[model samples]
Target: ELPEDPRWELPRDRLVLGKPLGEGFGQVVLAEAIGLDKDKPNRVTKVAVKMLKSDATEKDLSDLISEMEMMKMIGKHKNIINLLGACTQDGPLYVIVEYASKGNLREYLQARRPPYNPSHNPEEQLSSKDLVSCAYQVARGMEYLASKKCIHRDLAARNVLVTEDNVMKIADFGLPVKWMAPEALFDRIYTHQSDVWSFGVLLWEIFTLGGSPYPGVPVEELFKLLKEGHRMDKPSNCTNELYMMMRDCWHAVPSQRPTFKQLVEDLDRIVALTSNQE
Candidate 1:
């Protein structure tokens, strides 16, 4: 049975998990429970909780509530990160989510630096084939969200969580924007095409393994460059096929962007080709 307090309850020993894995903006803490299940002694259940910071305003609380509600609706897919439950008592908000033991893709890439060795590789240099496999998983997740008419406004690598089994789950729907027709951008509205733009950035992030986008370029300059059609330089180690895919996703015109369905088909081809090369 699920515990009464899903956020902090320990199932068997009643021991409370106290250490935080990481902390983020808005008082979000990535935490784990050590004694949730006595049968699985070595296993720990992980969760992310969003507690209201002492200085949080009413608007902040409302926004957090909205994000939680959105996650409840969009977190059902296997490829999408699971939302276990939420707690909003005592003025501190908490949302319990499935723990991704391996952490975010950005951290994973940063852990794996060059020479890019796989076996002796410290961060475990992910193979080209492995990267393609990840791409396929992300595509699957995006396809599901698209089918639901959900637009994930932020699709960067930092938001994509991985598992020990290499399973990819798209996370962070706090900035979810609804899908709209191609012409909707004229009104400054979000569309699936905009999501495609973010996906392109995500692909770049994956290939570089957390390398900064447009290295040395300030945020203000980067935005200016983006408006003028400047895109990130392809990483030296990235394969040509993957580079081409990233280019297609970064096209300036949203209308020119390919649909998630198209991405799935193209990514499947890449996966097969990369696997054959293995």
Candidate 2:
């Protein structure tokens, strides 16, 4: 008999699967589901269901399950997606997590360009200040994750979610090469510093309204370029101070990179400075 954590398990019948939200190459698919909240009795909440394809290998299944367990272990944070429950008992294996109605941060920002249209939805229009605040919230979330000694291998605009109220919540960890620090890329190493390095890329994404990272470089040559101390050019819209902080994030030595705690405090100051200015 396999031991299972009953608290994290849910009845398969209670989950009503709906339209697909997002998907991976061929292994996993994220779908919409209305499921009862684990903590609240009989309260159905809109959630995201992540499951592997029918052809998934046992390795894939174990990887997905580990991610689910890790999410559950970390507990909940306002800036991190909350894992609701899972249906690993029978029919199909899947995890239900809190849904962010606004979708991923990249698409959300891409839809709203520089000229924040007066005609656009008042709530959807984002200013420079609002964008900077988004970066701040992401830092807040990363700070929380670092406190728990959790490394979000994937931290990018596409992985971060935007909620109904425009709050930024970090989600869907990955091992994206573009976002990886030099050490992570070269030595296959990952640490809180590496996550901090990715946060710097996320910051660039926000300032550029979701522009691609390292715009012109081929992925194959990024490691060589990084080895020579080459770094990303600051986006036109990014402030010098912010760019400087990002440069620090890409420091050659992981020990020199700013800690998430430092990032949170620095970003907090930036956000506060902006609010006071206008």
Candidate 3:
């Protein structure tokens, strides 16, 4: 709505559907978008199509469109999923985005877990370097957003995607309450620092290999305690330095937390320190 871009609109004839890929506001289907990248030349390219239902209400349509416009505001970055285009024609409405062949980060980490989740086991023990590198990529993306004076409102491992080459890219601009900032849960407000808090929880998700935070604690109860200075324990077997970094972002006072600019450096250092340990 701000600046007009005709490329953001896609015709129905260009898309070739594959299988259904879960659902959000509506059904999400895996589709091949033809002629998108001239780089691919003569071949069709894979893309995830987020389809809105025919019966979608006005509010659902508004929320979906608003998110797309917000994405346009963020523009495209290497570590952020770019909105390729959309279909608003007299057909099933869909928002097209770049496909992450490996899907979300949560699934990637969960695949490494043995069973009920131990800190580490030989079967599939993700190394310190592995964990640090994962967090590193996420921080890079957040750093870019913070530098641009943007806040992600929702940031979490589950909301992030991993490409086939293991590149972590932030995704899902709407809906992610579990990883919401403490102040966000209280006042329904968010800022870049709140995004930093969510990223701390994201770091926990990385080191723990996708373990759930707070376990059985209700979100409201968790929020109450967090306000009272209670923070989540370090993920099992998490390094002291890393846990300390997590603690810094989880500071009760938002002003006390590190900026994403600073946090990216922290993660970079951790990655370098743990590289040889891999």
Screening candidate 3 with a backbone cut-off below 3 angstroms (N, C-alpha, C), the clashing residue pairs are: none
Q: List, residue by residue over 42-138, the lDDT tens digit for candidate 2.
A: 6666777888876778877777777887887788899988887778767667777777889888888877874542325423457667877898899
Give the distance in Å from residue 1's predicted Cα in candidate 1 to where it truly belongs.
26
Best by lDDT: 3
lDDT (10s digit) by residue, model 3, range 161-204: 98877889988753256688878988988999999999999988
* Comparing 1 and 3 on lDDT, the stronger one: 3
Q: Which segments of model 2 are wrong by more than 4 Å?
A: 1-4, 24-42, 115-124, 276-278
- Sort by lDDT, top down from the best: 3, 2, 1
What does the lDDT read for residue 30 in candidate 2? 45
| Local lDDT at 225 for model 3 | 79
How well is each residue in 1-278 modelled by candidate 1, as lDDT tens digits?
Answer: 11245443334232233556565536656666554455776766666656567787888767776776777666487787877655554334566666677888877777776763342536655788877778888888998899888887777788898876778989775551111122333355667787787787778777877776666666545555565767777887788878888888777677788888999999898888785345
Winner by lDDT between candidate 2 and candidate 1: 2
What number of backbone clashes does candidate 3 have, counting pairs of residues 3 or more apart or in separate chains?
Answer: 0
Ranking of all predicted structures according to TM-score, beginning with the best and ending with the worst: 3, 2, 1
- Provide the TM-score for each candidate, comma-separated: 0.77, 0.87, 0.89
- What overall lDDT goes with each candidate model? 0.69, 0.79, 0.81
